[PDB]
Homo-oligomer: A and B are copies of this chain.
Amino acid sequence: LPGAEALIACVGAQRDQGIAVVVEDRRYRPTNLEPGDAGIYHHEGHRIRLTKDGRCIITCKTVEVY
């Protein structure tokens, strides 16, 4: 979304050829998680989280397989 903080890494030190490598959104980030986690999120909940003891939690609203 607009307002995210990007890290622009200029190529060959020109201020052109600017390439954005990472775009973080600190306002909508999951916090206070267990030591080992890895998932995918959205800016309102919607977490496909992999938790410590073999738990593939899928927190959404209306999941639609196709």
Contact = CB atoms under 8 A, between A and B. Distances in A.
Interface of A: 1, 7, 9, 11, 19, 21-22, 35-46, 48, 50, 53-66
Contacts of A44: 54
Give the oligomeric copy count: 3
Contacts of A46: 50, 54, 56
A45 to B, nearest CB: 8
Counting chain B CB atoms within 10 Å of each CB, the highest count among A11, A21, A54 belongs to A54
Contacts of A53: 61
Given A55-B61, A57-B66, A63-B65, A40 B42 contact: no
A18 to B, nearest CB: 12
